Structure formats: C-alpha cells, structure tokens
Amino acid sequence: YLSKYAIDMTEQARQGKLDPVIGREEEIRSTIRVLARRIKSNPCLIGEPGIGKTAIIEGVAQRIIDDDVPTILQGAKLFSLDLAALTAGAKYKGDFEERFKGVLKEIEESKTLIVLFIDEIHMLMGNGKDDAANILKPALSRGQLKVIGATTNNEYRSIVEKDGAFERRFQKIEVAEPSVRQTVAILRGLQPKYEIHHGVRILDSALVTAAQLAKRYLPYRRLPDSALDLVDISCAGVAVARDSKPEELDSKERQLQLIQVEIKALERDEDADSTTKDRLKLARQKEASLQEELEPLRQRYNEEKHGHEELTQAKKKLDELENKALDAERRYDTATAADLRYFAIPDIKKQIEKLEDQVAEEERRAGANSMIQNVVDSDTISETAARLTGIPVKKLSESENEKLIHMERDLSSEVVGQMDAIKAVSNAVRLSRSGLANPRQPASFLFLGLSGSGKTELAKKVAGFLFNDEDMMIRVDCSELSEKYAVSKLLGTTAGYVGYDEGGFLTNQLQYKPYSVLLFDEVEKAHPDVLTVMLQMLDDGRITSGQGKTIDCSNCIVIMTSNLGAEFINSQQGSKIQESTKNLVMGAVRQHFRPEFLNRISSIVIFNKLSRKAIHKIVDIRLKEIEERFEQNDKHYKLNLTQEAKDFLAKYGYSDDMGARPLNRLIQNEILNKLALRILKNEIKDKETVNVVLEAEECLEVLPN
C-alpha cells in the first residue's frame, strides 16, 4: 500500500506537524510554478545539503493545504516517498521494484492529482540507473505524476553526466543560504518552538548572535542548521540549567541531613547531659532554620516554574489555535476560524505577555526567577559555541570593527616593526569588509622583503586575530608546483581521473576552514598555470574543486610570499625599505607576475629590514611566548635577558641568511635544554633568573642555575 512509508505531508502539515517556513517563498513559488508547468512539471532543489531544502518542499505542502497554489494544482496532494519505502520496505531483491511500482501505481490510481517528492532524489537512479525508478518514474511522469526532487550540487552534477534525461525532465532551483539577517528572521519565526521545547525564553539578541556565531564560527555547516544547532543546543543547555533547582535545594536539604543525622546521634550518650551533646537542641533549631530557607526557596522555585510552564502552555495554545484557524479558513468554515481568530488567539497573546511578567525578567538579572531562562546572546550562545568551537569568550566577544584600531597594534605587539605592512594588511581586512568590496574579493597581499623579516609570521599572527586561530591558515608549498600541477593544485585531480584528492590545499582545507587565510609559500616559483588559477583566486576566487567540481570561496584572505626582491633588499642598508629600492622590487614583481594578477592584490607590501633594534625586542616577545605558555606557572624565570642575552641572541639570531629565523634554534639549543635538565635534576624548582655565563658563539648564553 501507498500508506506504507509514503507520508501525506499535507495531512501532516494540516495537523500542525510541520514547522512554519520562513524566507523561502521565492524558491517555493519557483517550485510551484514548475509543478504548474504542463511539460516540465518536475522541480528540483539543488545547492548545499546542510541548508536542508526540504522545508521548501514542506512549504509547498502547506500551500496545498491552504491552497495558496495555482488552482490547476488545487486538487494536489503531496507525499514524502523515500528511504524506508525502498529499504526497510524491502526484504528480497525485487521488493525494491515492487515498492516503487506498487506504490506508484496506487499514486496514479484515481485519487486526484498527486505530487510526490524525494529528498534524496539521488536514491533514484541509484549510483548508475539500475531502474531505481530511473525509467519507471519518468514513464509514470508521462502519466501525470509530478515529482519534486532534492539533491546536492555534487549529486545532480554526477547524475547529469550519467544520464542527462533527468535534467531534461527537471527544473533545478538552487536553494540559497539565507543571510544572517534573514536567518534571524527565520529564527524568530521558529523562536516560540524552541521556547516551548525547553521552557525558556530566548533573547531576541540571542537569536541574532546564534545566527552570527553560527555563521562566524561554524560556517562549515549551513547557517539554517548551524543557527538552529546553537538555538536548540543552547536552549537545552538552559533546560539543563533549569534543572539546577536542586543545587540550592540540596545544599539546604543535605544540610538538613547532616543535622538530622547528628540529632539522633546527639540524643543519647554518656555525655548527653553536657552542652557537648545538648547542642542537639541547636541542631533542631538549625534543622528548622534550613526548613525556613527551604520553604520560600522551594515555593519560589515552584511559583516561578509554574509561571514558565503556564507561559509555555499559552504559547502552545496560541499556535494550536492558529493551526486550526488556518485549516478552517481554507475550508471556508470561517465560523470555526472565527472561534479562534476573534478573542482566543489574541487573548492567548495577552496571556503570554502576562505570563512573561510572572517569569519576571527584571533589572536585577536575566530572569528574576531562579529557573534561569532567556537564552543570553552573549554568555549562553557564546558558551554554547565554546562547547562547540572551544576558545574563550574573547573569541566569542568583539565589536569586530574595533580590530582595525586594536589589531594593528596588537599585531605590532606580536611582530616587531613592519608597521606600514601591518597597517596595509589590517586595513584590507576590516576595510574590505566595511568598504563592502565584492565579497569574492577578500583581502590579499604580496609579501616582499626577505625571509626572516617575519612577513609570514605576520600573516600567521593575523590569522590569530582574524579567527582567534593562528592555525586557521592554509599554507601552500608553491615551490612544489612543477608542470604536473595536479593534486597539489588549487583544483587538484580532475573529475573522473585517478585520485580523489582534490584541491590539494585549498579544497582540502577550506572545506573545514571557509573563513581563513591562505598563504602561498614562495609564490614566485609557482608554475604559470598555477599563477593563473591563483589570479582567479585573487578576484572572484570561485575555485572549482578537482572531483566534486564545487566552489566555496569568500573570506579566503590571501598572502603570497617571495624573496623576489632579494638583491634590492640586500642592497638596502637602512630599515624602512628606501624609495627606488622598492621600485626595483616592483620591477622584479612585474617580471614575475602579470599586471592582471598584481592588480587583484589589495596591496603589494615590502617588508622592512628590521635589524638589531627590532630583534632586540623580538627576543623578549619570543622568550615570553615560550614561558607564557610553558605548562603551568610553577617556574617563571625573570626573563631578564639583559642586554647580554638580548644582543648575543640578536647577533646569533638576525642573520641576513634568514633574518631572525635562527632565533628559534637559539634558546632551544642554548638554554631550554638546560632548563629541562636542571629542573628535572631537582636543582631548579621554581622562579630563576636569566643572564649569560660568559669557538664561534662559545659562551652559548647559559643561564644561572
């Protein structure tokens, strides 16, 4: 029977068993217009699967119930036919086929216009036709059977390369991820569902931050989903908080126990006549005192709890009344709609407001009540995210804009000098955003000046501030870009060719890190073909993967690096790269890259010869970096390098061969080895001081012990 597994979605939705659908109307209308088409009556939802898409289909079911359809579809009924219909519904080979033909024939059989839909449209045609109604359904569609399908970009793209008839039969509609703003409106629409689900209110701001954070920190998941995860999760987290009632009750009740236990113990003994044991009477006074606290505590918890329960039920009833009104209105049973629309629905609205007054959010806190409700925009959602993303509130709390005026400073704290570079970079980061640059034109730079200048480290630190994650960066070995430029290429292995490794670095990492910075290590050595795909990446960087052939590029900040101007930089005797010298570098830039590439870069930036005066500061930054993390602070050298270690390190550090790079071999192989030893030998146990105990570099720093 069709009744097995096929779900009458219009009946389901009619019964109020369908969530309201918000902000999809254009896609829904498109779907309906397709169903209306006399020939190509079969729409298909395409795009990114985390977006769900199904709500659109369900939106159609709702339109059918309410008949907000073209009337040629007035008699339509919409059914969900999927998975279990062919899988759980089958025991032996061939049952699969019968579930199709059996049901589908019943679908044709007389009972008005039936539209079916399959959310995994890909289940049909299997992985290579096998008549998983691959032919049958089309045959049946000749016989009216209108079908709504849903798929993914990966799926139909493979389908049309194996078939193509599907495409000829289907009107693909891509489902767009809603903007955060749209998402919030959506969340508001769904807000009472979640409030009901958990017995909590949700701060409107929380709806906002859920969308913002879902988007900002969990972008790998499509926003409608991710946002709702923050909502239902955070709401549940609050529901868990709503069961913290016992923490106060048990504190007092456990104290009653200790007292009740002592009272009998105290009641009879050799010393019963002494004030030592007669304290029993005081124990009873304390047992009573705790009861005095427990009475208003328990009463408060229950009064407030009831206010939340009543609020919740009022919201449930408002929604049930509206569901019924909507049914009655299309039925033209407006008298019964009136029973809901007049007085009842608005009265419940007013009951809800009064019940929120019982919840009593007050100037004292987010709910005067002890239930703890009101998902908090900041702390609740943020911590929810912390549970999902990790990293502390700083990550989760920013004005954003402010980074331009703080991050450039903090960056100068992380790396020494290069302030002009820092400003240039910082500027593109916040200004490309606030400047509303084409969103597919993320900040991008070419980092010139030489290795050892920290230009790379800057970018790393920038990732730090941009994403609260230095390891957000995607590094690309551009020197490993020979004529083969295959898997390692931004595109990776071409679809259908051997090797499923695609987008060597780019897909492979952006798919996990959509918000990221990418860095091209010695980009100057890249094969021109790569430089060409990079050109694309630098502007409208819509890079298509090797196998999937999908694109996901936006906030993909790009830093390219080179030692391209080295002779010019070597010539420079000062710090700030001199005029003309910089032009010599530009000459070389133009030799290596075409203007069409270069013009896409937010800025070409040449890093300065920071020299001694800078490394003199770098050594403190590095030194404290090491100790600041350490393990646990049960040590703490004064970190008093003094000019001895600072300068010996600088001399042993800032080599023109690699600038400051040796610094991180220094320390390690000069003192850290000793720290470990002296500490593990139990010579050194806490604190300590830094100084130098005086062949090349033979003093080797050597700290006090």
* Residue 616 binds which of a second copy, ligand ADP, none (CB < 5-8 A, kind-dependent): none
Residue list 631-690, contact with ligand ADP (CB under 6 A): 658-661, 663-664
Is residue 209 a contact point for ligand ADP (CB under 6 A)? no
**Residue 525's CB: how many other CB atoms inside 10 A?**
18
From 106-114, 438-446, 489-497, 617-625, give the range in contact with ligand ADP by CB under 6 A: 617-625
* Residue 480 binds which of a second copy, ligand ADP, none (CB < 5-8 A, kind-dependent): a second copy
* Eight-state DSSP code of residue 671: I
Ranges assigned E (strand) in 153-208: 170-174
Tell the burial category of 154 from Cβ atoms under 10 Å away from its Cβ (0-12, 13-18, 19+). Answer: middle
How far from 644 is each of 652, 669, 687, 690, 700, CA to CA, in Å?
12, 17, 20, 10, 11
Binding mask 559-578 for ligand ADP (x = CB under 6 A): --------------------
* Residue 23 binds which of ligand ADP, a second copy, none (CB < 5-8 A, kind-dependent): ligand ADP
Longest dimension (CA), the chain: 103
Nearer to ligand ADP, 49 or 192 (CB): 49
* Eight-state DSSP code of residue 545: P
Nearer to a second copy, 221 or 609 (CB): 221
Q: Helix, strand or coil for residue 121? A: helix
Nearer to ligand ADP, 283 or 450 (CB): 450
Is residue 52 a contact point for ligand ADP (CB under 6 A)? yes
Is residue 455 a known part of a binding site? Answer: yes
Q: Which helix (H) or strand (E) element contains residue 503?
A: none
Q: How far is the CB of 575 from a second copy (least distance, A)?
A: 17
Out of 41, 456, 493, 547, point to the residue binding ligand ADP (CB under 6 A): 456
Q: How far is the CB of 336 from ligand ADP (least distance, A)?
A: 27
* Residue 416 binds which of a second copy, ligand ADP, none (CB < 5-8 A, kind-dependent): ligand ADP
Q: How far is the CB of 57 from a second copy (least distance, A)?
A: 15
Instruction: Return the bridge partners of 117, or none.
Output: 80, 148
Comparing C-alpha atoms, which of 465, 552, 547 is closest to residue 506?
552
Binding mask 586-615 for ligand ADP (x = CB under 6 A): ---------x--------------x-----
Q: How far is the CB of 34 from a second copy (least distance, A)?
A: 7
What is the distance between the alpha carbons of residues 358 and 368, in angstroms, rounded to a whole number? 9
* Residue 484 binds which of a second copy, ligand ADP, none (CB < 5-8 A, kind-dependent): none
Nearer to ligand ADP, 141 or 370 (CB): 141
Is residue 453 a contact point for ligand ADP (CB under 6 A)? yes
Residue list 412-441, contact with ligand ADP (CB under 6 A): 415-417
Nearer to ligand ADP, 245 or 525 (CB): 525
Out of 50, 126, 514, 528, point to the residue binding ligand ADP (CB under 6 A): 50
Tell the burial category of 442 from Cβ atoms under 10 Å away from its Cβ (0-12, 13-18, 19+). Answer: buried
HEC string of 623-651 equals: HHHHHHHCCCCCCCCCCCCHHHHHHHHHH
Nearer to a second copy, 328 or 416 (CB): 328
What is the distance between the alpha carbons of residues 64 and 205, in angstroms, rounded to a whole number? 34
From 45-53, 95-103, 252-260, 282-290, give the range in contact with ligand ADP by CB under 6 A: 45-53
- The answer to whether 692 and 645 have CB atoms below 8 angstroms apart is yes
Is residue 237 a contact point for ligand ADP (CB under 6 A)? no
* Eight-state DSSP code of residue 365: B
Starting at the edge strand that comes first in sequence, how are the strands of the sheet with 42-46 ordered?
7-8, 77-80, 114-118, 146-150, 42-46, 170-174
What is the distance between the alpha carbons of residues 226 and 215, in angstroms, rounded to a whole number? 7
Is residue 457 a contact point for ligand ADP (CB under 6 A)? yes
> For strand 444-448 and strand 603-606, is the pairing parallel, antiparallel, or unpaired?
parallel
- The answer to whether 308 and 243 have CB atoms below 8 angstroms apart is no
* Residue 50 binds which of ligand ADP, a second copy, none (CB < 5-8 A, kind-dependent): ligand ADP
Q: How far is the CB of 26 from a second copy (least distance, A)?
A: 9
Nearer to a second copy, 195 or 616 (CB): 195
Is residue 105 a known part of a binding site? Answer: no
Is residue 75 a known part of a binding site? Answer: no
Q: Tokens standing for 266? A: 């105290």
Q: Tokens standing for 46? A: 């395409």
Q: Residue 400: what residue type? A: E
**Residue 551's CB: how many other CB atoms inside 10 A?**
15
Q: Alpha-carbon Rg of the chain, whole angstroms?
A: 34
Q: How far is the CB of 243 from ligand ADP (least distance, A)?
A: 23
Binding mask 19-38 for ligand ADP (x = CB under 6 A): x-xxxx--------------
Q: Tokens standing for 513? A: 């890190």
- The answer to whether 653 and 615 have CB atoms below 8 angstroms apart is yes
Q: Helix, strand or coil for residue 22? A: coil
From 191-199, 284-292, 333-341, 447-455, give the range in contact with ligand ADP by CB under 6 A: 447-455
* Residue 377 binds which of a second copy, ligand ADP, none (CB < 5-8 A, kind-dependent): none
What is the distance between the alpha carbons of residues 447 and 524, in angstroms, rounded to a whole number? 11
Is residue 479 a known part of a binding site? Answer: no
Q: Give the contacts of 142 (CB within 8 A, at least 6 positions apart).
A: none
Residue list 148-167, contact with ligand ADP (CB under 6 A): none
Is residue 16 a contact point for ligand ADP (CB under 6 A)? no
What is the distance between the alpha carbons of residues 689 and 680, in angstroms, rounded to a whole number? 17
Q: Which helix (H) or strand (E) element contains residue 118?
A: strand 114-118
Q: How far is the CB of 665 from a second copy (least distance, A)?
A: 9
Is residue 50 a known part of a binding site? Answer: yes
CB-side neighbour CA atoms (13 Å) of 79 = 24
Is residue 47 a known part of a binding site? Answer: yes
Q: How far is the CB of 653 from ligand ADP (least distance, A)?
A: 8
Q: How far is the CB of 391 from ligand ADP (least distance, A)?
A: 21
Please work out the total of residues on this chain that contact ligand ADP, with binding judged by CB under 6 A: 41
Q: Residue 221: what residue type? A: R
Q: How far is the CB of 583 from ligand ADP (least distance, A)?
A: 18
Is residue 307 a known part of a binding site? Answer: no
Nearer to ligand ADP, 13 or 416 (CB): 416
Is residue 622 a contact point for ligand ADP (CB under 6 A)? yes
What is the distance between the alpha carbons of residues 423 and 405, in angstroms, rounded to a whole number? 9
Is residue 327 a contact point for ligand ADP (CB under 6 A)? no
**Residue 42's CB: how many other CB atoms inside 10 A?**
25
What residues are designated binding site for ATP? 47-54, 449-456
What residues are designated binding site? 47-54, 449-456
- Binding residues for ligand ADP (CB under 6 A): 19, 21-24, 49-56, 119, 168, 186, 190, 224-225, 228, 415-417, 451-457, 595, 610, 618, 621-622, 658-661, 663-664
